[PDB]
Amino acid sequence: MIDLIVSQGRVADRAAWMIEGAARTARALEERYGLKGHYVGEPAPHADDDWSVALPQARETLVAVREAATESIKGDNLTVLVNNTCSVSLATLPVVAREHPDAVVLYIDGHGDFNTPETTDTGYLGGMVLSGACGLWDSGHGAGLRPEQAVLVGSRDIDEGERELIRKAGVRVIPPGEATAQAVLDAVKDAPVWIHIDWDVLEPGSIPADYTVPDGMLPAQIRAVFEAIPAERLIGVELAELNAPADSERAEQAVAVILDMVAPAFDAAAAR
Ligand SMILES: [Mg+2]
Ligand SMILES: [Mn+2]
Protein backbone atom coordinates (compact mmCIF):
# COMPACT_ATOMS: atom_id res chain seq x y z
CA MET A 1 0.00 0.00 0.00
CA ILE A 2 1.01 3.62 -0.71
CA ASP A 3 0.05 6.50 1.62
CA LEU A 4 0.06 9.78 -0.35
CA ILE A 5 0.50 13.08 1.54
CA VAL A 6 0.53 16.39 -0.35
CA SER A 7 1.68 19.77 0.92
CA GLN A 8 -0.34 22.73 -0.34
CA GLY A 9 0.68 25.30 2.26
CA ARG A 10 3.45 27.77 1.60
CA VAL A 11 6.75 26.71 3.16
CA ALA A 12 9.09 29.60 2.27
CA ASP A 13 8.31 29.28 -1.50
CA ARG A 14 10.30 31.72 -3.63
CA ALA A 15 9.04 30.20 -6.90
CA ALA A 16 5.58 30.88 -8.29
CA TRP A 17 4.33 27.44 -9.33
CA MET A 18 5.68 24.85 -6.88
CA ILE A 19 2.40 24.50 -4.98
CA GLU A 20 0.71 23.97 -8.37
CA GLY A 21 3.43 21.55 -9.44
CA ALA A 22 2.89 19.49 -6.30
CA ALA A 23 -0.86 19.37 -6.92
CA ARG A 24 -0.35 18.22 -10.52
CA THR A 25 2.14 15.52 -9.47
CA ALA A 26 -0.22 14.26 -6.77
CA ARG A 27 -3.12 14.10 -9.21
CA ALA A 28 -1.07 12.00 -11.66
CA LEU A 29 -0.14 9.57 -8.87
CA GLU A 30 -3.75 9.37 -7.68
CA GLU A 31 -4.96 8.54 -11.20
CA ARG A 32 -2.17 6.04 -11.89
CA TYR A 33 -2.26 4.17 -8.57
CA GLY A 34 -5.93 4.57 -7.57
CA LEU A 35 -5.02 6.61 -4.47
CA LYS A 36 -6.54 9.58 -2.68
CA GLY A 37 -4.04 12.02 -1.25
CA HIS A 38 -4.11 13.61 2.16
CA TYR A 39 -3.77 17.33 1.34
CA VAL A 40 -2.29 19.63 4.00
CA GLY A 41 -2.11 23.42 4.17
CA GLU A 42 -3.55 26.46 2.39
CA PRO A 43 -1.81 28.14 -0.59
CA ALA A 44 -0.20 31.57 -0.17
CA PRO A 45 1.81 33.66 -2.66
CA HIS A 46 5.54 33.30 -3.07
CA ALA A 47 7.86 35.86 -1.48
CA ASP A 48 11.57 36.54 -0.99
CA ASP A 49 11.33 36.58 2.79
CA ASP A 50 14.09 35.67 5.23
CA TRP A 51 14.00 32.16 6.73
CA SER A 52 13.36 33.74 10.13
CA VAL A 53 10.05 35.09 8.79
CA ALA A 54 9.05 32.24 6.46
CA LEU A 55 9.64 29.45 9.01
CA PRO A 56 7.07 30.71 11.59
CA GLN A 57 4.60 31.45 8.80
CA ALA A 58 4.83 27.77 7.77
CA ARG A 59 4.39 26.38 11.30
CA GLU A 60 0.80 25.21 10.92
CA THR A 61 1.51 23.46 7.61
CA LEU A 62 4.72 21.88 8.94
CA VAL A 63 3.06 20.54 12.09
CA ALA A 64 0.22 19.08 10.02
CA VAL A 65 2.66 17.37 7.63
CA ARG A 66 4.60 16.01 10.61
CA GLU A 67 1.49 14.46 12.11
CA ALA A 68 0.40 12.89 8.80
CA ALA A 69 3.88 11.55 8.08
CA THR A 70 4.11 10.14 11.61
CA GLU A 71 0.91 8.14 11.12
CA SER A 72 2.05 6.81 7.75
CA ILE A 73 5.57 5.93 8.93
CA LYS A 74 4.30 4.04 11.98
CA GLY A 75 2.16 1.80 9.74
CA ASP A 76 3.44 -0.57 7.10
CA ASN A 77 2.90 1.30 3.84
CA LEU A 78 5.26 3.22 1.58
CA THR A 79 5.07 6.86 2.71
CA VAL A 80 5.02 9.18 -0.32
CA LEU A 81 5.12 12.93 0.21
CA VAL A 82 4.55 15.27 -2.73
CA ASN A 83 5.90 18.57 -1.43
CA ASN A 84 5.91 22.08 -2.83
CA THR A 85 9.40 22.82 -1.42
CA CYS A 86 12.31 20.94 0.08
CA SER A 87 11.62 22.89 3.29
CA VAL A 88 8.68 20.60 4.07
CA SER A 89 11.31 18.02 4.91
CA LEU A 90 12.31 20.04 7.99
CA ALA A 91 9.21 18.40 9.46
CA THR A 92 9.48 14.96 7.90
CA LEU A 93 13.16 14.06 8.23
CA PRO A 94 13.18 14.18 12.07
CA VAL A 95 10.21 11.79 12.06
CA VAL A 96 12.10 9.41 9.75
CA ALA A 97 15.23 9.62 11.92
CA ARG A 98 13.15 9.07 15.06
CA GLU A 99 11.29 6.03 13.72
CA HIS A 100 14.20 4.53 11.73
CA PRO A 101 17.43 5.58 13.45
CA ASP A 102 19.41 3.32 11.11
CA ALA A 103 17.91 4.76 7.92
CA VAL A 104 20.09 6.36 5.25
CA VAL A 105 18.62 9.46 3.63
CA LEU A 106 19.42 9.87 -0.06
CA TYR A 107 19.00 13.61 -0.56
CA ILE A 108 18.92 13.96 -4.36
CA ASP A 109 19.35 17.61 -5.22
CA GLY A 110 21.36 19.88 -7.50
CA HIS A 111 22.23 21.76 -4.28
CA GLY A 112 23.54 20.72 -0.90
CA ASP A 113 20.73 22.44 1.09
CA PHE A 114 23.22 22.49 3.96
CA ASN A 115 23.39 26.19 4.91
CA THR A 116 22.93 27.50 8.45
CA PRO A 117 21.65 30.93 9.55
CA GLU A 118 25.33 31.93 9.74
CA THR A 119 26.36 30.69 6.28
CA THR A 120 23.33 31.40 4.08
CA ASP A 121 23.97 34.06 1.43
CA THR A 122 20.29 34.32 0.40
CA GLY A 123 18.36 33.64 3.63
CA TYR A 124 16.32 30.99 1.81
CA LEU A 125 14.91 28.31 4.13
CA GLY A 126 15.02 25.80 1.26
CA GLY A 127 18.81 25.98 1.27
CA MET A 128 18.90 25.06 5.01
CA VAL A 129 16.92 21.78 4.99
CA LEU A 130 19.46 18.96 5.34
CA SER A 131 21.55 20.94 7.84
CA GLY A 132 18.43 21.56 9.95
CA ALA A 133 17.47 17.88 9.99
CA CYS A 134 21.05 17.00 10.98
CA GLY A 135 21.02 19.51 13.85
CA LEU A 136 23.56 22.09 12.63
CA TRP A 137 20.87 24.67 13.42
CA ASP A 138 17.49 24.54 15.18
CA SER A 139 14.44 24.66 12.89
CA GLY A 140 12.02 24.18 15.76
CA HIS A 141 10.93 20.85 14.26
CA GLY A 142 13.58 18.57 15.71
CA ALA A 143 16.67 17.04 14.20
CA GLY A 144 18.25 13.68 14.98
CA LEU A 145 19.42 12.69 11.49
CA ARG A 146 23.04 11.59 11.77
CA PRO A 147 25.12 13.34 9.08
CA GLU A 148 26.92 10.01 8.64
CA GLN A 149 23.56 8.66 7.43
CA ALA A 150 22.87 11.46 4.91
CA VAL A 151 24.08 11.15 1.30
CA LEU A 152 23.84 14.03 -1.15
CA VAL A 153 23.22 12.63 -4.63
CA GLY A 154 23.68 14.71 -7.75
CA SER A 155 24.81 17.89 -5.99
CA ARG A 156 27.35 20.00 -7.86
CA ASP A 157 28.96 23.43 -7.97
CA ILE A 158 28.63 23.82 -4.20
CA ASP A 159 29.86 27.02 -2.55
CA GLU A 160 33.23 26.47 -0.89
CA GLY A 161 31.90 27.56 2.51
CA GLU A 162 28.89 25.25 2.37
CA ARG A 163 31.02 22.41 0.98
CA GLU A 164 33.20 22.80 4.08
CA LEU A 165 30.26 22.36 6.46
CA ILE A 166 29.24 19.27 4.46
CA ARG A 167 32.65 17.63 4.75
CA LYS A 168 33.10 18.63 8.41
CA ALA A 169 29.75 17.08 9.31
CA GLY A 170 30.57 13.86 7.43
CA VAL A 171 27.87 14.13 4.76
CA ARG A 172 28.93 12.21 1.64
CA VAL A 173 28.41 13.71 -1.81
CA ILE A 174 27.91 11.67 -4.99
CA PRO A 175 27.99 14.09 -7.99
CA PRO A 176 25.91 13.34 -11.12
CA GLY A 177 28.68 11.64 -13.09
CA GLU A 178 29.30 9.25 -10.19
CA ALA A 179 25.61 8.71 -9.29
CA THR A 180 25.06 5.28 -10.79
CA ALA A 181 22.59 2.89 -9.19
CA GLN A 182 25.46 0.80 -7.84
CA ALA A 183 27.23 3.83 -6.38
CA VAL A 184 24.06 4.80 -4.54
CA LEU A 185 23.44 1.19 -3.44
CA ASP A 186 26.98 0.91 -2.07
CA ALA A 187 26.46 4.11 -0.10
CA VAL A 188 23.37 2.83 1.72
CA LYS A 189 25.01 -0.52 2.62
CA ASP A 190 22.52 -2.57 4.73
CA ALA A 191 20.26 0.29 5.86
CA PRO A 192 16.62 1.05 5.14
CA VAL A 193 16.34 4.04 2.85
CA TRP A 194 14.42 7.32 2.60
CA ILE A 195 14.61 9.12 -0.76
CA HIS A 196 14.18 12.89 -1.00
CA ILE A 197 14.23 14.40 -4.54
CA ASP A 198 14.48 18.06 -5.57
CA TRP A 199 13.82 18.18 -9.31
CA ASP A 200 16.54 20.79 -9.88
CA VAL A 201 18.93 17.82 -9.76
CA LEU A 202 17.88 17.04 -13.36
CA GLU A 203 19.77 18.14 -16.44
CA PRO A 204 17.69 20.90 -18.13
CA GLY A 205 15.33 18.87 -20.23
CA SER A 206 15.99 19.47 -23.90
CA ILE A 207 17.10 15.83 -24.02
CA PRO A 208 18.04 16.41 -27.67
CA ALA A 209 21.52 15.96 -26.18
CA ASP A 210 23.07 12.75 -27.51
CA TYR A 211 26.47 14.40 -28.10
CA THR A 212 26.68 16.51 -24.90
CA VAL A 213 27.87 15.26 -21.53
CA PRO A 214 25.22 16.31 -19.00
CA ASP A 215 25.95 18.45 -15.98
CA GLY A 216 22.85 17.30 -14.09
CA MET A 217 21.41 13.86 -13.54
CA LEU A 218 19.39 12.26 -16.33
CA PRO A 219 15.91 10.83 -15.67
CA ALA A 220 17.30 7.39 -16.50
CA GLN A 221 19.74 7.71 -13.60
CA ILE A 222 16.91 8.58 -11.18
CA ARG A 223 14.83 5.66 -12.44
CA ALA A 224 17.83 3.34 -12.06
CA VAL A 225 18.11 4.33 -8.38
CA PHE A 226 14.43 3.54 -7.78
CA GLU A 227 14.89 0.21 -9.61
CA ALA A 228 17.89 -0.68 -7.39
CA ILE A 229 16.53 -0.03 -3.88
CA PRO A 230 14.81 -3.25 -2.71
CA ALA A 231 11.12 -2.70 -1.97
CA GLU A 232 11.45 -4.14 1.53
CA ARG A 233 14.11 -1.55 2.40
CA LEU A 234 12.35 1.57 1.06
CA ILE A 235 10.73 3.58 3.86
CA GLY A 236 9.36 6.46 1.85
CA VAL A 237 9.86 8.97 -0.94
CA GLU A 238 9.56 12.76 -1.10
CA LEU A 239 9.08 14.54 -4.43
CA ALA A 240 9.72 18.29 -4.23
CA GLU A 241 10.12 21.49 -6.26
CA LEU A 242 8.33 21.03 -9.59
CA ASN A 243 7.90 24.63 -10.76
CA ALA A 244 5.17 24.22 -13.40
CA PRO A 245 1.90 26.17 -13.73
CA ALA A 246 -1.39 24.41 -13.23
CA ASP A 247 -3.09 23.51 -16.54
CA SER A 248 0.13 24.12 -18.48
CA GLU A 249 1.35 21.73 -21.15
CA ARG A 250 4.70 22.01 -19.37
CA ALA A 251 3.27 20.46 -16.20
CA GLU A 252 1.68 17.57 -18.11
CA GLN A 253 5.02 16.85 -19.79
CA ALA A 254 6.95 17.09 -16.52
CA VAL A 255 4.65 14.80 -14.54
CA ALA A 256 4.85 12.12 -17.26
CA VAL A 257 8.63 12.08 -16.88
CA ILE A 258 8.23 11.95 -13.09
CA LEU A 259 5.88 8.96 -13.29
CA ASP A 260 8.44 7.13 -15.43
CA MET A 261 11.21 7.73 -12.90
CA VAL A 262 9.32 6.65 -9.77
CA ALA A 263 7.40 3.75 -11.33
CA PRO A 264 9.82 0.94 -10.24
CA ALA A 265 9.51 1.78 -6.54
CA PHE A 266 5.84 2.77 -6.58
CA ASP A 267 4.75 -0.25 -8.64
CA ALA A 268 6.52 -2.58 -6.21
CA ALA A 269 4.89 -0.96 -3.17
CA ALA A 270 1.44 -1.10 -4.77
CA ALA A 271 2.02 -4.83 -5.41
CA ARG A 272 2.71 -5.71 -1.74
MG1 LIG B 1 17.99 22.11 -5.32
MN1 LIG C 1 16.42 21.42 -2.47
mmCIF file of C-alpha atoms and ligand atoms in Angstrom:
data_model
loop_
_atom_site.group_PDB
_atom_site.id
_atom_site.type_symbol
_atom_site.label_atom_id
_atom_site.label_comp_id
_atom_site.label_asym_id
_atom_site.label_seq_id
_atom_site.Cartn_x
_atom_site.Cartn_y
_atom_site.Cartn_z
ATOM 1 C CA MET A 1 0.000 0.000 0.000
ATOM 2 C CA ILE A 2 1.014 3.621 -0.713
ATOM 3 C CA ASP A 3 0.055 6.495 1.620
ATOM 4 C CA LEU A 4 0.063 9.777 -0.349
ATOM 5 C CA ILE A 5 0.504 13.077 1.538
ATOM 6 C CA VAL A 6 0.527 16.393 -0.351
ATOM 7 C CA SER A 7 1.682 19.773 0.925
ATOM 8 C CA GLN A 8 -0.337 22.730 -0.341
ATOM 9 C CA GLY A 9 0.679 25.298 2.260
ATOM 10 C CA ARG A 10 3.452 27.773 1.600
ATOM 11 C CA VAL A 11 6.747 26.706 3.158
ATOM 12 C CA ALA A 12 9.087 29.604 2.268
ATOM 13 C CA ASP A 13 8.312 29.276 -1.495
ATOM 14 C CA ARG A 14 10.296 31.721 -3.634
ATOM 15 C CA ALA A 15 9.035 30.200 -6.898
ATOM 16 C CA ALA A 16 5.578 30.878 -8.288
ATOM 17 C CA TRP A 17 4.328 27.442 -9.327
ATOM 18 C CA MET A 18 5.681 24.846 -6.884
ATOM 19 C CA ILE A 19 2.397 24.497 -4.976
ATOM 20 C CA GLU A 20 0.706 23.971 -8.365
ATOM 21 C CA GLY A 21 3.433 21.554 -9.444
ATOM 22 C CA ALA A 22 2.895 19.487 -6.297
ATOM 23 C CA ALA A 23 -0.858 19.374 -6.915
ATOM 24 C CA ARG A 24 -0.347 18.219 -10.518
ATOM 25 C CA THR A 25 2.138 15.515 -9.474
ATOM 26 C CA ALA A 26 -0.223 14.265 -6.770
ATOM 27 C CA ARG A 27 -3.119 14.102 -9.214
ATOM 28 C CA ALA A 28 -1.070 11.998 -11.656
ATOM 29 C CA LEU A 29 -0.138 9.567 -8.870
ATOM 30 C CA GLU A 30 -3.754 9.370 -7.683
ATOM 31 C CA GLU A 31 -4.963 8.539 -11.201
ATOM 32 C CA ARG A 32 -2.171 6.044 -11.886
ATOM 33 C CA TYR A 33 -2.265 4.166 -8.571
ATOM 34 C CA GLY A 34 -5.925 4.568 -7.565
ATOM 35 C CA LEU A 35 -5.022 6.605 -4.469
ATOM 36 C CA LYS A 36 -6.537 9.581 -2.680
ATOM 37 C CA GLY A 37 -4.038 12.024 -1.254
ATOM 38 C CA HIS A 38 -4.111 13.610 2.164
ATOM 39 C CA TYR A 39 -3.767 17.332 1.342
ATOM 40 C CA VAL A 40 -2.294 19.630 4.001
ATOM 41 C CA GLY A 41 -2.112 23.420 4.170
ATOM 42 C CA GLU A 42 -3.552 26.457 2.391
ATOM 43 C CA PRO A 43 -1.811 28.140 -0.585
ATOM 44 C CA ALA A 44 -0.197 31.570 -0.168
ATOM 45 C CA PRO A 45 1.810 33.664 -2.660
ATOM 46 C CA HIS A 46 5.536 33.298 -3.068
ATOM 47 C CA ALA A 47 7.861 35.861 -1.483
ATOM 48 C CA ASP A 48 11.573 36.537 -0.991
ATOM 49 C CA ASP A 49 11.335 36.575 2.793
ATOM 50 C CA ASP A 50 14.086 35.666 5.233
ATOM 51 C CA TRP A 51 14.003 32.164 6.725
ATOM 52 C CA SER A 52 13.356 33.738 10.131
ATOM 53 C CA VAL A 53 10.050 35.093 8.790
ATOM 54 C CA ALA A 54 9.055 32.236 6.464
ATOM 55 C CA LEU A 55 9.636 29.448 9.015
ATOM 56 C CA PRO A 56 7.066 30.707 11.593
ATOM 57 C CA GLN A 57 4.598 31.446 8.797
ATOM 58 C CA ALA A 58 4.833 27.769 7.769
ATOM 59 C CA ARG A 59 4.392 26.379 11.301
ATOM 60 C CA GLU A 60 0.796 25.214 10.920
ATOM 61 C CA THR A 61 1.514 23.458 7.610
ATOM 62 C CA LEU A 62 4.717 21.883 8.938
ATOM 63 C CA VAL A 63 3.062 20.541 12.088
ATOM 64 C CA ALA A 64 0.224 19.084 10.017
ATOM 65 C CA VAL A 65 2.661 17.367 7.633
ATOM 66 C CA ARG A 66 4.603 16.009 10.611
ATOM 67 C CA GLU A 67 1.491 14.461 12.110
ATOM 68 C CA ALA A 68 0.395 12.894 8.797
ATOM 69 C CA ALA A 69 3.880 11.550 8.077
ATOM 70 C CA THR A 70 4.115 10.138 11.612
ATOM 71 C CA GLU A 71 0.910 8.144 11.121
ATOM 72 C CA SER A 72 2.051 6.810 7.748
ATOM 73 C CA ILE A 73 5.573 5.932 8.925
ATOM 74 C CA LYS A 74 4.301 4.042 11.977
ATOM 75 C CA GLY A 75 2.158 1.803 9.737
ATOM 76 C CA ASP A 76 3.443 -0.574 7.097
ATOM 77 C CA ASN A 77 2.901 1.302 3.839
ATOM 78 C CA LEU A 78 5.255 3.225 1.582
ATOM 79 C CA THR A 79 5.069 6.858 2.714
ATOM 80 C CA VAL A 80 5.019 9.176 -0.322
ATOM 81 C CA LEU A 81 5.119 12.933 0.208
ATOM 82 C CA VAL A 82 4.555 15.273 -2.732
ATOM 83 C CA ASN A 83 5.898 18.574 -1.428
ATOM 84 C CA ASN A 84 5.910 22.083 -2.834
ATOM 85 C CA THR A 85 9.397 22.819 -1.424
ATOM 86 C CA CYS A 86 12.314 20.942 0.084
ATOM 87 C CA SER A 87 11.619 22.893 3.292
ATOM 88 C CA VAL A 88 8.676 20.602 4.069
ATOM 89 C CA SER A 89 11.312 18.019 4.906
ATOM 90 C CA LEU A 90 12.310 20.042 7.986
ATOM 91 C CA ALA A 91 9.206 18.397 9.459
ATOM 92 C CA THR A 92 9.478 14.960 7.899
ATOM 93 C CA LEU A 93 13.157 14.058 8.226
ATOM 94 C CA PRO A 94 13.183 14.185 12.070
ATOM 95 C CA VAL A 95 10.207 11.791 12.061
ATOM 96 C CA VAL A 96 12.098 9.407 9.752
ATOM 97 C CA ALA A 97 15.227 9.624 11.917
ATOM 98 C CA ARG A 98 13.149 9.067 15.062
ATOM 99 C CA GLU A 99 11.289 6.029 13.720
ATOM 100 C CA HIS A 100 14.200 4.533 11.726
ATOM 101 C CA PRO A 101 17.429 5.584 13.449
ATOM 102 C CA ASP A 102 19.407 3.323 11.112
ATOM 103 C CA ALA A 103 17.907 4.762 7.918
ATOM 104 C CA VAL A 104 20.092 6.355 5.250
ATOM 105 C CA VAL A 105 18.623 9.465 3.629
ATOM 106 C CA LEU A 106 19.420 9.871 -0.065
ATOM 107 C CA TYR A 107 18.997 13.612 -0.557
ATOM 108 C CA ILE A 108 18.922 13.961 -4.356
ATOM 109 C CA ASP A 109 19.350 17.615 -5.220
ATOM 110 C CA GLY A 110 21.359 19.880 -7.501
ATOM 111 C CA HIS A 111 22.228 21.757 -4.281
ATOM 112 C CA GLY A 112 23.545 20.722 -0.895
ATOM 113 C CA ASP A 113 20.727 22.440 1.087
ATOM 114 C CA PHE A 114 23.224 22.493 3.958
ATOM 115 C CA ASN A 115 23.388 26.187 4.913
ATOM 116 C CA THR A 116 22.926 27.504 8.453
ATOM 117 C CA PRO A 117 21.650 30.934 9.553
ATOM 118 C CA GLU A 118 25.329 31.929 9.742
ATOM 119 C CA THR A 119 26.363 30.686 6.276
ATOM 120 C CA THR A 120 23.326 31.401 4.080
ATOM 121 C CA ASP A 121 23.967 34.057 1.426
ATOM 122 C CA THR A 122 20.291 34.319 0.402
ATOM 123 C CA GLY A 123 18.359 33.644 3.628
ATOM 124 C CA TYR A 124 16.316 30.986 1.815
ATOM 125 C CA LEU A 125 14.906 28.310 4.133
ATOM 126 C CA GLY A 126 15.016 25.800 1.264
ATOM 127 C CA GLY A 127 18.809 25.977 1.268
ATOM 128 C CA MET A 128 18.901 25.062 5.013
ATOM 129 C CA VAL A 129 16.923 21.775 4.993
ATOM 130 C CA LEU A 130 19.465 18.957 5.341
ATOM 131 C CA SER A 131 21.545 20.943 7.843
ATOM 132 C CA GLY A 132 18.435 21.555 9.953
ATOM 133 C CA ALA A 133 17.466 17.878 9.989
ATOM 134 C CA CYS A 134 21.052 17.001 10.976
ATOM 135 C CA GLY A 135 21.024 19.513 13.854
ATOM 136 C CA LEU A 136 23.561 22.093 12.635
ATOM 137 C CA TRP A 137 20.872 24.670 13.423
ATOM 138 C CA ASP A 138 17.489 24.538 15.184
ATOM 139 C CA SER A 139 14.444 24.658 12.893
ATOM 140 C CA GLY A 140 12.021 24.178 15.764
ATOM 141 C CA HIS A 141 10.930 20.845 14.263
ATOM 142 C CA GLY A 142 13.583 18.572 15.715
ATOM 143 C CA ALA A 143 16.665 17.036 14.200
ATOM 144 C CA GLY A 144 18.247 13.683 14.977
ATOM 145 C CA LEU A 145 19.424 12.692 11.493
ATOM 146 C CA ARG A 146 23.042 11.593 11.773
ATOM 147 C CA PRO A 147 25.124 13.342 9.077
ATOM 148 C CA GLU A 148 26.922 10.007 8.640
ATOM 149 C CA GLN A 149 23.557 8.662 7.425
ATOM 150 C CA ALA A 150 22.869 11.464 4.906
ATOM 151 C CA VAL A 151 24.085 11.147 1.301
ATOM 152 C CA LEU A 152 23.835 14.032 -1.152
ATOM 153 C CA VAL A 153 23.219 12.628 -4.628
ATOM 154 C CA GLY A 154 23.679 14.707 -7.753
ATOM 155 C CA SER A 155 24.811 17.889 -5.990
ATOM 156 C CA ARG A 156 27.348 19.995 -7.858
ATOM 157 C CA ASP A 157 28.962 23.433 -7.969
ATOM 158 C CA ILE A 158 28.633 23.821 -4.198
ATOM 159 C CA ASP A 159 29.862 27.021 -2.547
ATOM 160 C CA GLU A 160 33.231 26.465 -0.894
ATOM 161 C CA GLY A 161 31.902 27.556 2.505
ATOM 162 C CA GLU A 162 28.894 25.245 2.373
ATOM 163 C CA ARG A 163 31.023 22.411 0.984
ATOM 164 C CA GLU A 164 33.202 22.797 4.077
ATOM 165 C CA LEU A 165 30.261 22.356 6.458
ATOM 166 C CA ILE A 166 29.237 19.270 4.457
ATOM 167 C CA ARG A 167 32.648 17.629 4.749
ATOM 168 C CA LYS A 168 33.101 18.633 8.409
ATOM 169 C CA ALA A 169 29.753 17.077 9.307
ATOM 170 C CA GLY A 170 30.568 13.861 7.427
ATOM 171 C CA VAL A 171 27.873 14.126 4.757
ATOM 172 C CA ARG A 172 28.927 12.212 1.644
ATOM 173 C CA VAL A 173 28.413 13.715 -1.808
ATOM 174 C CA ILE A 174 27.912 11.674 -4.991
ATOM 175 C CA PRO A 175 27.992 14.089 -7.989
ATOM 176 C CA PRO A 176 25.910 13.343 -11.123
ATOM 177 C CA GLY A 177 28.682 11.639 -13.087
ATOM 178 C CA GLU A 178 29.297 9.250 -10.192
ATOM 179 C CA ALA A 179 25.608 8.711 -9.294
ATOM 180 C CA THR A 180 25.059 5.275 -10.790
ATOM 181 C CA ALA A 181 22.587 2.890 -9.186
ATOM 182 C CA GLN A 182 25.461 0.805 -7.841
ATOM 183 C CA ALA A 183 27.226 3.827 -6.381
ATOM 184 C CA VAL A 184 24.060 4.798 -4.536
ATOM 185 C CA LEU A 185 23.444 1.186 -3.441
ATOM 186 C CA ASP A 186 26.985 0.907 -2.067
ATOM 187 C CA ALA A 187 26.455 4.115 -0.105
ATOM 188 C CA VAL A 188 23.368 2.827 1.720
ATOM 189 C CA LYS A 189 25.012 -0.524 2.620
ATOM 190 C CA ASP A 190 22.523 -2.565 4.734
ATOM 191 C CA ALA A 191 20.262 0.291 5.865
ATOM 192 C CA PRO A 192 16.616 1.047 5.145
ATOM 193 C CA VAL A 193 16.341 4.041 2.846
ATOM 194 C CA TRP A 194 14.422 7.324 2.602
ATOM 195 C CA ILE A 195 14.605 9.123 -0.758
ATOM 196 C CA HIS A 196 14.177 12.894 -1.002
ATOM 197 C CA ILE A 197 14.233 14.404 -4.536
ATOM 198 C CA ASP A 198 14.482 18.064 -5.570
ATOM 199 C CA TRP A 199 13.822 18.179 -9.306
ATOM 200 C CA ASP A 200 16.541 20.794 -9.885
ATOM 201 C CA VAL A 201 18.935 17.822 -9.764
ATOM 202 C CA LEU A 202 17.885 17.036 -13.360
ATOM 203 C CA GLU A 203 19.773 18.143 -16.443
ATOM 204 C CA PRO A 204 17.695 20.900 -18.132
ATOM 205 C CA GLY A 205 15.331 18.872 -20.230
ATOM 206 C CA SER A 206 15.987 19.467 -23.899
ATOM 207 C CA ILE A 207 17.096 15.828 -24.021
ATOM 208 C CA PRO A 208 18.037 16.409 -27.668
ATOM 209 C CA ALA A 209 21.517 15.965 -26.179
ATOM 210 C CA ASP A 210 23.067 12.747 -27.515
ATOM 211 C CA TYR A 211 26.469 14.400 -28.099
ATOM 212 C CA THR A 212 26.682 16.506 -24.903
ATOM 213 C CA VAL A 213 27.870 15.256 -21.531
ATOM 214 C CA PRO A 214 25.220 16.308 -18.996
ATOM 215 C CA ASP A 215 25.951 18.449 -15.977
ATOM 216 C CA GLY A 216 22.855 17.295 -14.085
ATOM 217 C CA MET A 217 21.412 13.856 -13.537
ATOM 218 C CA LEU A 218 19.387 12.259 -16.329
ATOM 219 C CA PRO A 219 15.905 10.829 -15.670
ATOM 220 C CA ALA A 220 17.296 7.388 -16.502
ATOM 221 C CA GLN A 221 19.737 7.706 -13.597
ATOM 222 C CA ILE A 222 16.914 8.580 -11.180
ATOM 223 C CA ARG A 223 14.832 5.662 -12.439
ATOM 224 C CA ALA A 224 17.828 3.338 -12.056
ATOM 225 C CA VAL A 225 18.109 4.331 -8.377
ATOM 226 C CA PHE A 226 14.429 3.541 -7.779
ATOM 227 C CA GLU A 227 14.892 0.211 -9.608
ATOM 228 C CA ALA A 228 17.889 -0.676 -7.394
ATOM 229 C CA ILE A 229 16.527 -0.028 -3.879
ATOM 230 C CA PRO A 230 14.809 -3.251 -2.707
ATOM 231 C CA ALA A 231 11.121 -2.701 -1.970
ATOM 232 C CA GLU A 232 11.452 -4.143 1.534
ATOM 233 C CA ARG A 233 14.109 -1.546 2.400
ATOM 234 C CA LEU A 234 12.349 1.573 1.058
ATOM 235 C CA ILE A 235 10.725 3.580 3.864
ATOM 236 C CA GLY A 236 9.361 6.455 1.846
ATOM 237 C CA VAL A 237 9.858 8.966 -0.942
ATOM 238 C CA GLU A 238 9.557 12.759 -1.099
ATOM 239 C CA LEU A 239 9.080 14.544 -4.430
ATOM 240 C CA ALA A 240 9.717 18.292 -4.228
ATOM 241 C CA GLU A 241 10.121 21.486 -6.257
ATOM 242 C CA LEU A 242 8.329 21.029 -9.589
ATOM 243 C CA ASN A 243 7.896 24.630 -10.761
ATOM 244 C CA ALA A 244 5.167 24.215 -13.396
ATOM 245 C CA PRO A 245 1.905 26.173 -13.726
ATOM 246 C CA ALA A 246 -1.392 24.405 -13.229
ATOM 247 C CA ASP A 247 -3.093 23.511 -16.543
ATOM 248 C CA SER A 248 0.130 24.123 -18.481
ATOM 249 C CA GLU A 249 1.348 21.727 -21.150
ATOM 250 C CA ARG A 250 4.703 22.015 -19.371
ATOM 251 C CA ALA A 251 3.269 20.456 -16.201
ATOM 252 C CA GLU A 252 1.679 17.566 -18.107
ATOM 253 C CA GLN A 253 5.021 16.846 -19.794
ATOM 254 C CA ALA A 254 6.954 17.094 -16.516
ATOM 255 C CA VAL A 255 4.651 14.798 -14.538
ATOM 256 C CA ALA A 256 4.848 12.122 -17.257
ATOM 257 C CA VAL A 257 8.633 12.082 -16.881
ATOM 258 C CA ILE A 258 8.232 11.949 -13.088
ATOM 259 C CA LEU A 259 5.879 8.961 -13.291
ATOM 260 C CA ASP A 260 8.440 7.129 -15.432
ATOM 261 C CA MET A 261 11.215 7.733 -12.900
ATOM 262 C CA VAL A 262 9.322 6.651 -9.765
ATOM 263 C CA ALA A 263 7.401 3.746 -11.326
ATOM 264 C CA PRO A 264 9.817 0.941 -10.243
ATOM 265 C CA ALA A 265 9.512 1.783 -6.538
ATOM 266 C CA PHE A 266 5.844 2.768 -6.581
ATOM 267 C CA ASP A 267 4.748 -0.251 -8.638
ATOM 268 C CA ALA A 268 6.524 -2.578 -6.206
ATOM 269 C CA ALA A 269 4.885 -0.958 -3.172
ATOM 270 C CA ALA A 270 1.438 -1.104 -4.773
ATOM 271 C CA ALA A 271 2.021 -4.830 -5.411
ATOM 272 C CA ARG A 272 2.709 -5.710 -1.742
HETATM 273 MG MG MG B 1 17.991 22.108 -5.321
HETATM 274 MN MN MN B 2 16.417 21.415 -2.471
#
